[PDB]
Amino acid sequence: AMINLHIQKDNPKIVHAFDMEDLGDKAVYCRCWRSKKFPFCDGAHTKHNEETGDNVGPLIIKKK
Amino acid sequence: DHRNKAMINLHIQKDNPKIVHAFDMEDLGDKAVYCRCWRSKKFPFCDGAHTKHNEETGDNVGPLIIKKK
Numbered sequence: 791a792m793i794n795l796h797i798q799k800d801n802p803k804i805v806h807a808f809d810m811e812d813l814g815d816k817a818v819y820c821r822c823w824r825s826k827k828f829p830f831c832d833g834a835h836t837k838h839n840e841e842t843g844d845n846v847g848p849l850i851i852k853k854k
Numbered sequence: 855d856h857r858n859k860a861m862i863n864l865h866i867q868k869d870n871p872k873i874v875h876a877f878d879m880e881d882l883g884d885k886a887v888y889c890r891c892w893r894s895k896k897f898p899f900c901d902g903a904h905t906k907h908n909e910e911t912g913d914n915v916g917p918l919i920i921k922k923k
């Protein structure tokens with residue numbers, strides 16, 4: 791059972807790296823691999839959780 | 855039976871109906887490496903578990919890194 795079904799399948803291992811300096815106020819990152827704006831969350835987790843009974847959700851990196 | 859759709863997170867914090875983590879950058883140090891495969895024993899941090907997931911399932915998931923320029 792794969793987790794990522796369709797994103798960047800020509801990449802054998804998808805890793806993203808960002809510098810905190812470039813982030814601004816808040817960045818919300820997808821952990822469900824269903825976002826159409828991956829690596830950013832676009833709310834797709836909700837339908838994923840609904841269909842599957844799962845409980846996954848995003849990672850938020852923000853300024854204090 | 856394709857009516858039963860596979861979960862992404864199999865085991866982590868199942869008493870939590872939707873797992874979200876929120877961190878302030880100032881608290882992150884030089885680098886933080888976050889799990890996006892839900893198999894790490896150190897979740898929400900990556901501990902290398904994605905490698906075994908990828909070999910077993912044919913997937914290509916990997917972590918998210920936040921660091922200083």
Ligand code: FES
Pocket residue numbers: 819820821822823824825830831832833834835836846847848849
């Ligand atoms: S769209 Fe994937 S965690 Fe929100």
Ligand code: FES
Pocket residue numbers: 888889890891892893894899900901902903904905915916917918
């Ligand atoms: S252990 Fe999950 S992405 Fe590395």
